[PDB]
């Protein structure tokens, strides 16, 4: 029967699996056992769909004898299917076994070759990202433990409305409180508050066990809701030290973790590109452009040659080609394109009559001219040369749709279809002549040439989303139905809704709000109930990983291809054209300031925001008189030395700010109020008087010059999508407070609202016709709504508000249109993913081609320079072999090999014992673990005082690791000493022993040490983000921070501008992108400000501030990331198979034990074991040392030394030159003169090394 396994069976089975997938798509879940007829038919169909697979699996086993992989997966799903069918038929378990129906499409996808190839590539790229998966696992442990020690159950009190126990009556957001003698949020006015409260968010988010605090740390690492946890641990424990946790976790675990991932991925992509460029795949596209380029001019030359004549086109063709390409024709077609985009853009909601008439009349008035232009350009270049151009076909489709829309104009449907927008791609005609437009054509060229691979990757990602949506609706289908009044729309009811929810979780936005619903639906916080968070965690991790692997591989590969194609094709432009002649022609003062200016900056930072009269703003009110005169005196001393450069103008302006703001008088409500803000230019004075700062600033400005093209393209697409969305949601996003009214006229007066859906507590509210927070009435409003969508903040609300829109000036209808989610999906895919990852890839490839473009073409490729420099900087190390007999014994006991395993397990059980402190622990449990902790302290002390007598009291302090362990130990015994009696601080050191255990491992140490040395190598890139934070903190503090701390808005006791640290925290929260739009709304003008300050408070500057800050912060962080990545790029792409510094390090570590001191004196017989202990890659394998290896080692000319006086550098260089780059005899002087040409100075230290 192994003859029907041919094509028909394969395609038949693929069709069966596809039909099974669609059957699962339809299935739809119902709350609590309900079902319609479709579910009563699909359960019948999924018996034939099981018999087919059973028949398939029955023949293969007795035909092929299960170990093929995907065959095994098919077998598991089949056997689970039969077991499920038997159980369902015999029981009248359903949840358990209908889940394998999502494993079924996996077996589907493992039938297509070029999807299996893509998955293999993804899995091969996943392998290097395992150390940076271990370090992310050993941070959510070290910080979970710390959270266990600090916030164990401290967040269980809440206001209770003293007058009876009742049930937590305190606003519609129960928040922790304190006992006054405590340090949290007092309920103040009455309302005494007592323990016995589930938790801040139903008990799912709290530091109680090692499970609820190994999820709270994960949420604060994915940055989606870390401020909400910070506030909950803030107003429950105090506001003094809860930030050193929640900011040191995100500047160590969410940026220095997202940095390594990007670096490794970029390195792997570059390495793969270099490995794939050798086959010559770039040549085919390289030869494709010229073959296409040299066709149009060949054809039109042939075309116009026929027109010159040897039937009466003596006035047609002459004014056909020389009139559509006659300059003015173009430059006026551009004018008409601008007219069309103005016509379509100049529309809003509730337009005037004249605008509606004119923008409707001009449509066809321009369409007729452009349709004529079609033909006028058609018979000029003919049909072949017209249709060959890809961009010509774009305008072809645009005009076709324009003359086509007068059929569906009868019943709107597409409305005035947003096709008139898409014509502004012909406004890039003006862009045509702009700098590097012949890379934008190359951009789309590459993105369309690699379209097959792009589509395969996108299809694999889409299949992943589909599978995790089917499983999502199987798990949480019809279970998000609680008695709570609201009807949360992030459910898993249908397939479109499940897809939208999965897409929302995949982009991170509110991924922790669906997780809480999933946990509360499957029981609650418990052992079996709180296990469904695994679904969301795996979804997030895998989705983000695949998003990176798709949208960054596409960007990096295609953009590097385009850049290389440009730099290799426009290069020959000169060598071909310019040869037109070839045929024919043939510090004290600087300190004295850098101190004063920065101290003035910190003086202007620590002011009093909210108060206009105080002592801090009087000490710092009259502080600036020493500064202002000495700052002005610098100009006076320097002015007469000359008679003007650039930064001196900035100096003049920053000093004239004080020179004028001292006086002004008169109108003391303005002008002083802008020069008060204009004092944020004092720090910028230091940019000129400090070298290196100019270097980094100029680098950033040249980066602006490089990425202006991408920025302009992104903003043009923003304008385009805003224009399409205007004709789609123009005024349809209105709603009333009462859902029973759907008209502004009807939505008036009062109506009854019931508290918490209780019919016995009616409260009168007014009726208000309120527009959405982010509407689409005009182009400008859509430009902000789409920006907020692209920031992945608040976009689900916009999606589920626009879904309910049906008609203009009418109320919403539940799920009126679900196909409108495609607009947001396409916008997120194209702008929020493609055009941002293309930005990042452009920066990465630009920084990678710069630098190493130094062209160190003194031969000596990029391994031997490092090998030679390491050979030069080398010496035998120190071993410290102890004397005095018994000291050698103690050192041997310490320096044993299997005692290290004992020392590692004594830490492994220490962390496990420490990480069991739950809440409400049995009294005996605490003391039982306390004595165990004391025993661990005793045993570790024993180890330290055993190492002291072994390594001598000197070497115990040399290695930082032993010093670090000593510091940890001595801070552990005195904790036991104070246990007889601050305390919270001293319980913490054991996590440092844990992080040492983390540090164990060669790969972890190499990666981390290299990245830290790279970060230290560039300290002038962090003093750009620091400057930005300083300037915007001061600006926002002076402008927007005077408002009252109203707990009902997004400005409260924790989020405000009323102090510099709090302003910095607010800017940090906006930088991480938590609620920046909400803070911008809260900074809108008309908010009542503090009564202590003498509703006019607020400003309209909020939009500019909170948009410019976000964009600039993103740019600066990306610049820092790319700088630190490209400083270590040499390590990132190394091909460890070839010789590397690690081999030399291990060679040195083996060699050092044979020399009591550094010296350089060796023995002659140690070579016998040296040739055996060298690694087979570095040296020789398992061959006998007394062989050709020794023969060639002695054959070469060693330096003229004694039997054993050869130095370490000489033999190391001999080994490295025999391993790689072998040369014939007589080339020793060639190496001698080469090492003095490009290599660094030897300082005449190779006198003996010459021979």
Ligand X SMILES: CC(C)CCC[C@@H](C)[C@H]1CC[C@H]2[C@@H]3CC=C4C[C@@H](O)CC[C@]4(C)[C@H]3CC[C@]12C
Ligand Y SMILES: *[C@@H]1O[C@H](CO)[C@@H](O)[C@H](O)[C@H]1NC(C)=O
Spacing of C-alpha 613 from chain mean position: 44
CB of 83 or CB of 792, closer to ligand X: 83
Query: Residue 390: in which H helix or E strand, if any?
Result: helix 390-404
Span near ligand X by CB under 6 A; candidates 93-101, 125-133, 212-220, 1202-1210: 93-101
Residue 941 touches ligand Y, criterion: CB under 6 A: no
Q: Which DSSP helix (H) or strand (E) runs through 98?
A: none
Residue 471 interacting partner from ligand X, ligand Y, none (CB closer than 5 to 8 Å by kind): ligand X
- Residue 91 touches ligand X, criterion: CB under 6 A: no
Residue 95 interacting partner from ligand X, ligand Y, none (CB closer than 5 to 8 Å by kind): ligand X
Cβ neighbourhood burial of 648 (10 Å; 0-12, 13-18, 19+): middle
Binding flag, residue 355, ligand X (CB under 6 A): no
Q: Which does 522 bind (CB under 5 to 8 A by kind): ligand X, ligand Y, none?
A: ligand X
The verdict on 541 binding ligand X (CB under 6 A) reads no
User: Would you say the C-alpha torsion 66, 70, 72, 74 has a positive or negative sign?
Assistant: negative
Question: For residues 1207 and 1160, is the Cβ–Cβ distance under 8 A?
Answer: yes
Per-residue string for binding with ligand Y, 772-811, x by CB under 6 A? ----------------------------------------
**Which among 839, 761, 813 has a CA at the least distance from the CA of 1121?**
839
Residues 7-26, interacting with ligand Y (CB under 6 A): none
Question: Is residue 876 within 8 Å of 1155, Cβ to Cβ?
Answer: yes
Beta carbons of 228 and 199 less than 8 angstroms apart: no
Residue 102 interacts with ligand X (CB under 6 A): yes or no: yes
Binds 800: which of ligand Y, ligand X, none (CB < 5-8 Å by kind): none
Place of tokens 């991408």: 710
Q: Outline where 2-92 has alpha helix (H).
A: 7-26, 37-64, 70-91
CA distance 529 to 1172: 58
Considering CB distances under 5 to 8 angstroms, the limit depending on partner class, which of ligand Y, ligand X, none binds residue 87?
none
Which does residue 1048 bind out of ligand Y, ligand X, none, counting CB within 5 to 8 angstroms by kind?
A: ligand Y
Q: Please tell me the distance from the alpha carbon of residue 193 to that of residue 201, in angstroms, as a whole number.
A: 18
Q: Alpha-carbon distance 1225 to 1229, whole Å?
A: 10
Alpha-helical regions (H) of 676-770: 682-685, 693-726
What span, in angstroms and rounded, lies between the C-alpha atoms of 603 and 618? 12
User: Could you say whether residue 211 binds ligand X (CB under 6 A)?
Assistant: no
Range in contact with ligand X (rule: CB under 6 A) among 100-108, 408-416, 973-981, 1060-1068: 100-108
Does 463 help bind ligand X (rule: CB under 6 A)? Answer: no
Contacts of 965 (CB under 8 A, 6+ apart): 944, 993, 996
23 vs 532, beta carbon nearer ligand X: 532
Does residue 465 interact with ligand X by CB under 6 A? no
The span from the CA of 1248 to the CA of 1251, in Å, is: 6
**For residues 39 and 737, which CB has a smaller minimum distance to ligand Y in the complex?**
737
Q: Is 793 flagged in the annotation as binding? A: yes
- Residue 19, interface with ligand X (CB under 6 A)? no
Q: Does 99 bind ligand X (CB under 6 A)?
A: yes
Instruction: Pick out residues in 1039-1098 that bind ligand Y (CB under 6 A).
Output: 1046, 1048-1049
Count of C-beta atoms within a 10 Å radius of residue 552: 20
744 is in an annotated binding site: no
Measured from the CB atom, is 538 or 1168 closer to ligand X?
538
Residues 499-538 that bind ligand X (CB under 6 A): 522, 528, 531-532, 534-535, 538
Q: 290 vs 1046, which CB is nearer to ligand Y?
A: 1046
Q: Which of 10, 95, 625, 977 binds ligand X (CB under 6 A)?
A: 95
| Least CB distance to ligand Y at residue 229 (A) | 23
102 binds, among ligand Y, ligand X, none (CB under 5 to 8 A by kind): ligand X
Cβ nearer to ligand X, comparing 469 with 1211 = 469
Q: Are 828 and 751 in contact (CB under 8 A)?
A: no
CB 890 within 8 A of CB 950: yes
Half-sphere exposure of 1202 (CA within 13 A, CB side): 6
Instruction: Select from ligand Y, ligand X, none the partner in contact with residue 534, using the beta carbon and a kind-dependent cut-off of 5 to 8 Å.
Output: ligand X
Least separation, in Å, of the C-beta of 531 and ligand X? Answer: 4
Residue 531 interaction partner, one of ligand Y, ligand X, none, beta carbon < 5-8 Å per kind: ligand X
Separation of alpha carbons 660 and 673, rounded Å? 12
Q: How far apart are CB 173 and ligand Y at their closest, in Å?
A: 13
Quote the least distance from Cβ 542 to ligand X, whole Å: 8
Given ligand Y, ligand X, none, residue 1049, with its beta carbon under 5 to 8 Å by kind, binds ligand Y
Q: Give the Cβ contact number of residue 404 at 10 Å.
A: 13
The least distance separating ligand X from the CB of residue 397, rounded to whole angstroms, comes to: 42
754, containing H or E segment: strand 750-754
Return the one option of ligand X, ligand Y, none that residue 305 interacts with (CB less than 5 to 8 A, by type).
none
- Closest CB to ligand Y among residues 59, 1089: 1089
- Beta carbon of residue 1237, minimum distance to ligand X (angstroms, whole number): 59
Please give the residues from 872 up to 901 whose contact with ligand Y meets the rule CB under 6 A.
none
Least distance in Å: CB of 1055 to ligand Y? 13
CA distances from 519 to 201, 202, 205, 541 (A): 11, 10, 11, 18
Q: To the nearest whole angstrom, how small is the minimum distance from the Cβ of residue 1049 to ligand Y?
A: 5
Binding piece for ligand X, criterion CB under 6 A, among 11-19, 91-99, 614-622, 713-721: 91-99
Half-sphere exposure of 306 (CA within 13 A, CB side): 10
Angle subtended by helix axes 923-955 and 899-914, to nearest 10: 140
Residues 1150, 1173 contacting (CB under 8 angstroms): yes
* Closest separation in Å from C-beta 1078 to ligand Y: 13
State in angstroms the smallest separation of the CB of 1043 from ligand Y: 9
Q: How far apart are CA 1251 and CA 1246, in angstroms?
A: 9
Find out whether 764 and 779 touch, Cβ atoms under 8 Å: no
Query: Which span sits near ligand X by CB under 6 A: 36-44, 97-105, 131-139, 671-679?
Result: 97-105
Q: Tell me how far apart the alpha carbons of residues 34 and 30 are, in angstroms, rounded to a whole number.
A: 5
Closest to 933 measured CA to CA, from 983, 973, 993, 978: 973
Residues 1162/1204, Cβ–Cβ less than 8 Å? yes
The answer for 167, left when phi > 0, alpha when psi is -120 to 50, beta otherwise, is beta
464 near ligand X, judged by CB under 6 A: no
- Tell whether 634 is in a known binding site: no
Count of chain residues binding ligand X (CB under 6 A)? 15
**Total residues interacting with ligand Y, rule: CB under 6 A:** 3
Question: Distance between CA 92 and CA 1225 in Å, rounded?
Answer: 88
* Residue nearest ligand Y, Cβ-based: 1046
100, 143, 729, 774: which one contacts ligand X (CB under 6 A)? Answer: 100
Comparing C-alpha atoms, which of 1150, 1169, 1166 is closest to residue 1206? Answer: 1166
Nearer to ligand Y by C-beta: 663 or 1091? Answer: 1091
Residue 96 contact, options ligand X, ligand Y, none, Cβ 5-8 Å cut-off depending on partner type:
ligand X
Contacts of 103 (CB under 8 A, 6+ apart): 73, 76, 77
**What is the nearest approach in angstroms of ligand Y to the Cβ of residue 1062?**
18
Residue 406 or 1046 with smaller CB distance to ligand Y: 1046
User: Annotated binding site for Ca(2+): which residue ranges?
Assistant: 224, 509, 793
Q: Where along the sequence are the contacts to ligand X (CB under 6 A)?
A: 95-96, 99-100, 102-103, 471, 475, 522, 528, 531-532, 534-535, 538
Q: Where along the sequence are the contacts to ligand Y (CB under 6 A)?
A: 1046, 1048-1049
User: Annotated binding site: which residue ranges?
Assistant: 224, 509, 793
């Amino acid at each position: 029967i192994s003859i029907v396994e041919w094509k028909p069976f394969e395609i038949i089975i693929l069709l069966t699996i596809f039909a099974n997938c669609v059957a699962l798509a339809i299935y739809i879940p119902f709350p609590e056992d309900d079902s319609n007829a479709t579910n009563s038919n699909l359960e019948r169909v999924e018996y034939l769909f099981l018999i087919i697979f059973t028949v398939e699996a029955f023949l293969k086993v007795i035909a092929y004898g299960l170990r093929n992989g995907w065959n095994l997966l098919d077998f598991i799903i089949v056997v689970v299917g039969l077991f499920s069918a038997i159980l369902e038929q015999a029981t009248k378990d359903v949840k358990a076994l209908r889940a394998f129906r999502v494993l079924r499409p996996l077996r589907l996808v493992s039938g297509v070759p070029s999807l299996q190839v893509v998955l293999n590539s993804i899995i091969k790229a996943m392998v290097p990202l395992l150390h940076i998966a271990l370090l992310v696992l050993f941070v959510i442990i070290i910080y979970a433990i710390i959270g266990l020690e600090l916030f164990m159950g401290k967040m269980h009190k809440t206001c209770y409305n003293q007058e009876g126990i009742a049930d937590v009556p305190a606003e519609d957001d129960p928040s922790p409180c304190a006992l006054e003698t405590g340090h949290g949020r007092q309920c103040q006015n009455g309302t005494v508050c007592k323990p016995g409260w589930d938790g801040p968010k139903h008990g799912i988010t709290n530091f109680d066990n090692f499970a609820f605090a190994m999820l709270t740390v994960f949420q604060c690492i994915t940055m989606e809701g870390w401020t909400d946890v910070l506030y909950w641990v803030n107003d429950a424990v105090g506001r003094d030290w809860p930030w050193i946790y929640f900011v040191t976790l995100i500047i160590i675990g969410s940026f220095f973790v997202l940095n390594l991932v990007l670096g490794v991925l970029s390195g792997e992509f570059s390495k793969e590109r270099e490995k794939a460029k050798a086959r010559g795949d770039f040549q085919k596209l390289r030869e494709k452009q010229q073959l296409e380029e040299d066709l149009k001019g060949y054809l039109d030359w042939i075309t116009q040659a026929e027109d010159i004549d040897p039937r009466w086109n003596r006035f047609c063709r002459r004014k056909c080609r020389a009139a559509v390409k006659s300059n003015v024709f173009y430059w006026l077609v551009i004018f008409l394109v601008f007219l069309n985009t103005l016509t379509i853009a100049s529309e809003h909601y509730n337009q005037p009559n004249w605008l509606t008439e004119v923008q409707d009349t001009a449509n066809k008035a321009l369409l007729a001219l452009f349709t004529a232009e079609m033909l006028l350009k058609m018979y000029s270049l003919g049909l072949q040369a017209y249709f060959v151009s890809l961009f010509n076909r774009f305008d072809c489709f645009v005009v076709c749709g324009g003359i086509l829309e007068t059929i569906l104009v009868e019943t709107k449907i597409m409305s005035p279809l947003g096709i008139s927008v898409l014509r502004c791609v012909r406004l890039l005609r003006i862009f045509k002549i702009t700098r590097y437009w012949n890379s934008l054509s190359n951009l789309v060229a590459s993105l369309l040439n690699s379209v097959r691979s792009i589509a395969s990757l996108l299809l694999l990602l889409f299949l992943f989303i589909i599978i995790f949506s089917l499983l999502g609706m199987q798990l949480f289908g019809g279970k998000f139905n609680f008695d709570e009044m609201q009807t949360r729309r992030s459910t898993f009811d249908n397939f479109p809704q499940s897809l939208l929810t999965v897409f929302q979780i995949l982009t991170g936005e509110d991924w922790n709000s669906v997780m809480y619903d999933g946990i509360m639906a499957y029981g609650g916080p418990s052992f079996p109930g709180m296990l469904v968070c695994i679904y969301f965690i795996i979804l997030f991790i895998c989705g983000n990983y695949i998003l990176l692997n798709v949208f960054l591989a596409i960007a990096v590969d295609n953009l590097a291809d385009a850049e290389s194609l440009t730099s290799a094709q426009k290069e020959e432009e000169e060598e071909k054209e310019r040869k037109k002649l070839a045929r024919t022609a043939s510090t004290i003062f600087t300190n004295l300031i850098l101190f004063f200016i920065l101290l003035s900056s910190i003086s202007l930072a620590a002011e009093d925001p909210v108060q206009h009269t105080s002592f801090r703003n009087h000490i710092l009110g009259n502080a600036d008189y020493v500064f202002t005169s000495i700052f002005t005196l610098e100009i006076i001393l320097k002015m007469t030395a000359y008679g003007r450069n650039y930064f001196n103008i900035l100096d003049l302006l920053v000093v004239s700010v004080s020179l004028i703001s001292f006086g002004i008088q008169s109108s003391a409500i303005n002008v002083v109020k802008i020069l008060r803000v204009l004092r944020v230019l004092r720090p910028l004075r230091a940019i000129n008087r400090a070298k290196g700062l100019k270097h980094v600033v100029q680098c950033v400005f040249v980066a602006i010059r490089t990425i202006g093209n991408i920025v302009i393209v992104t903003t043009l697409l923003q304008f385009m999508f805003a224009c399409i969305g205007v004709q789609l949601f123009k005024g349809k996003l209105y709603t009333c407070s009462d859902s029973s009214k759907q008209t502004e006229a009807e939505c008036k007066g009062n109506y009854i609202t019931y508290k918490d859906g209780e019919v016995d507590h009616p409260i009168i509210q007014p009726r208000s016709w309120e527009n959405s927070k982010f509407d689409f009435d005009n182009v400008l409003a859509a430009m902000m709504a789409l920006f907020t969508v692209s920031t992945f903040e608040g976009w689900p609300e916009l999606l589920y508000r626009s879904i309910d829109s049906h008609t203009e000036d009418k109320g919403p209808i539940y799920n009126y249109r679900v196909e409108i989610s495609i607009f947001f999906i396409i916008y997120i895919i194209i702008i929020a993913f493609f055009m941002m990852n293309i930005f990042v890839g452009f920066v990465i490839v630009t920084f990678q081609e710069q630098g190493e473009q130094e062209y160190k073409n003194c031969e000596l490729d990029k391994n031997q320079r490092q090998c030679v420099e390491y050979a030069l900087k080398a010496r035998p190390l120190r071993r410290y072999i102890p004397k005095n007999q018994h000291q050698y014994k103690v050192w041997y006991v310490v320096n044993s090999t299997y005692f290290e395993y004992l020392m590692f397990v004594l830490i492994l059980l220490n962390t496990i014992c420490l990480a069991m402190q739950h809440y409400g622990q049995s009294c005996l449990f605490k003391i039982a673990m306390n004595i165990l902790n004391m025993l661990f302290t005793g045993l570790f002390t024993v180890e330290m005082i055993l190492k002291l007598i072994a390594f001598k009291p000197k070497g115990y302090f040399s290695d930082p690791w032993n010093v670090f362990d000593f510091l940890i130990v001595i801070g552990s015994i005195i904790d036991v000493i104070l246990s007889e009696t601050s305390i919270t601080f001293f319980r913490l050191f054991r996590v440092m022993r844990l992080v040492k255990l983390l540090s164990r491992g060669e790969g972890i140490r190499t990666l981390l040490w290299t990245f830290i040395k790279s970060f230290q190598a560039l300290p002038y890139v962090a003093l750009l983000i620091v400057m930005l934070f300083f300037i915007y903190a001061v600006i926002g503090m002076q402008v927007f921070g005077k408002i009252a701390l109203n707990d009902t808005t997004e400005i409260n006791r924790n989020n405000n501008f009323q102090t510099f640290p709090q302003a910095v925290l607010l800017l940090f929260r906006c930088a991480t992108g938590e609620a920046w739009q909400d803070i911008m709304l809260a900074c809108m003008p008309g908010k009542k400000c503090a009564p202590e300050s003498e509703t006019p408070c607020g400003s309209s500057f909020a939009v500019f501030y909170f948009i410019s800050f976000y964009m600039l912060c993103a740019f600066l962080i990306i610049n820092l990331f790319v700088a630190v990545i490209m400083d270590n790029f040499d390590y990132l792409t190394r091909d460890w198979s070839i010789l590397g510094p690690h081999h030399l390090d291990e060679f040195k570590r083996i060699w050092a034990e044979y020399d009591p001191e550094a010296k350089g004196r060796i023995k002659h017989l140690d070579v016998v074991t040296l040739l055996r202990r060298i690694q087979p890659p570095l040296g020789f394998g398992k061959l006998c040392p007394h062989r050709v290896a020794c023969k060639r080692l002695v054959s070469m000319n060693m330096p003229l030394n004694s039997d054993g006086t050869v130095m370490f550098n000489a033999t190391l260089f001999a080994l490295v030159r025999t391993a790689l780059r072998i040369k014939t005899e007589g080339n020793l002087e060639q190496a001698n003169e080469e090492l003095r040409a490009i290599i660094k100075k030897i300082w005449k230290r190779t006198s003996m090394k010459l021979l």
